Structure 1
Amino acid sequence: ARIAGINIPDHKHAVIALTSIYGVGKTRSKAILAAAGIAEDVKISELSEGQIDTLRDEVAKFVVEGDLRREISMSIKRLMDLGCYRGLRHRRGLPVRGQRTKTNARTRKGPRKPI
């Protein structure tokens, strides 16, 4: 119930639980379970410690949690200090993939700031 250094829920099925690892979604969770030979509908608190060890080994293959976080952070910071268009967009906290900013863009710009 502690894979890649984080607590994962014991009450949920294995596929749903493994998605709690920052870096594993449904697809990677299914791949991990298949490679470790564990049913997709089994609940975490009902796996043998050997099975959890194998799961640890599998999830160790992929970059997750802190390593992934700092990888993403160094990619963003490289964009930043290069100061290309995407670096400038990231600095200003505006949409980065060519969306419209005349309206919407609330996810990047934050909620309404009245004048």
Structure 2
Amino acid sequence: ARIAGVDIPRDKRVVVSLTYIYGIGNTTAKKVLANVGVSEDVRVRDLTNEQTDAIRAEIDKLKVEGDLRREVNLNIKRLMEIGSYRGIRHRRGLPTRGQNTKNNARTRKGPT
């Protein structure tokens, strides 16, 4: 469920449906479809078991995980827990090069 992680849905073609997981942008998708030798196929996913297993094993060559979320969490956990001045404002969502916000909290929290 489905083939790798969860929820690779049909009714869309292959480069579209693979974007739906935490770890695929578009360059990862085109490179993984280039590593097998496949195509758009077609506008509904009608792959074969050879093709699905090949593109299943090639994604396993990456960081494409649900622990990739945990990888991000341990990244920002390294961040916020040294001192940390970047943790104080990391939780207040302002970038480490600064953005100088007195009305740009509506991106994250919506103070209105």
Q: Which bin holds the TM-score, normalised by the shorter protein?
A: 0.7 to 0.9
- Secondary structure of the residue that 1:69 maps to in structure 2? helix
Give a deviation string over 1:52-75, Cα, whole Å, max 9, x none. Answer: 000101111111131211110001
Identity, in percent, stands at 52
SS at match of 2:20: coil
Match of 1:94, as an amino acid? G
Structure 2 residue ranges without an equivalent (≥5): none
| Higher normalized helix content (fraction of residues) | 1
Q: What is the TM-score of this pair, normalised by structure 2?
A: 0.86
Structure 1's 22 and 44: CA in aligned 2 closer, same or farther, altered over 3 A?
Answer: farther
Aligned residues: 111
1:68-87 correspondence runs (5 A): 68-87=68-87
User: Unaligned stretches of 5+ in structure 1?
Assistant: none
Distance verdict in 2 for CA 1:64–1:44, change over 3 Å: farther
Query: In structure 2, what is the equivalent of residue 112 of structure 1?
Result: 111
Please, what TM-score do these two structures have when normalized by structure 1? 0.84
1:41 shift after superposition: 4.5
The equivalent of 1:12 in structure 2 is: 12
Q: Detail structure 1 runs of 4+ shifted over 2 Å in the superposition.
A: 1-4, 40-45
Is the contact between residue 12 and residue 43 of structure 2 (CA under 8 Å) also seen in structure 1?
Answer: yes
The code of the aligned residue for 1:8 comes to I
Helix, strand or coil at the partner of 1:19: helix
Distance 1:49 1:101 in 2: 52
